[PDB]
Symmetry: C3
Subunit: 103 residues, 3 copies
């Protein structure tokens, strides 16, 4: 099928709630990085990047969950990007496609 | 039309000048990460990521190259990656409307 | 031809071996970052005094390499061979399309830009 990477750049204090909400909905595989982005308004400030690769059919749901749980109503809540992924491979089994996501 | 992610891996001492040049040209939304590349083998680099309208890619690339170059090996590389969707977290706005920074 | 980004999220203790193997096969241009990950099931379970506690996010390393499409299979083989342990949490590889590669110094593009 089609696989997509959902990248969200959010406030660092929102990581725990967002990751919990994602986990509760069955999205447990995620990668988390520390990054910097512009402040609201000159130094950049800390943000968190969450990356999740999912089935294309799950993108809307993932985006809804992230938006609901990451938002505060103030400028600087962040942005989400969807990027095509053409191949996914599990390291330990060399499995590919959606199989590589599960277990 | 479409959106693209422009990723540049550059020298850490070039971050300020690049960021200022991009800002002056109206590109204020960028994400910065501390990474390592070549090259004790791996040395510190900075990854800049900006998602822009397709029409702005050439201009962004020009600005980054102009301001990040030194003429020595290790100046870095720029990748352009397709972005199929952009969503503003607070408002749930999408596409070009989501790209405006406030 | 086309360029592809190979991203691998692996165990931090596998970075040196993977990087060496990649280098020996001619892939020297790579970017490495420190990230945190969690896998599908459980999360790691450690013990304090008599009881267990869970650490959800644990340190991983992200390697990113942009290569000619023709080299993807080989990159993936090398990473898997050298990053695997047989235990859950070995990691994942994603292949992402790259539409343009530009060398900052020269503004060369394409295969010219990957040659280091
Ligand atoms: N769907 C996903 N999206 C993004 N990153 C993921 C995803 N699933 C797993 N990862 C990353 O890969 C690492 C290993 O995942 P895990 O499922 O534990 O590996 P394995 O497939 O070997 O069991 C995690 O620590 C995380 O960084």
């Amino acid at each position: 099928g089609s696989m997509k990477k959902v990248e969200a750049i959010i406030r660092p204090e929102k990581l725990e709630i967002v990751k919990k909400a994602l986990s509760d909905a069955g999205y447990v595989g995620m990668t988390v990085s520390e990054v910097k982005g512009r402040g609201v308004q000159v130094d950049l400030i800390p943000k968190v990047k969450i990356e999740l690769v999912v089935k294309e059919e799950d993108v809307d749901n993932v985006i809804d969950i992230i938006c609901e749980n990451a938002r505060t109503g103030n400028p600087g809540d962040g942005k989400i990007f969807v990027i095509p992924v053409e191949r996914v491979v599990r390291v330990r089994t060399k499995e590919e496609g959606k199989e590589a996501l599960l277990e």
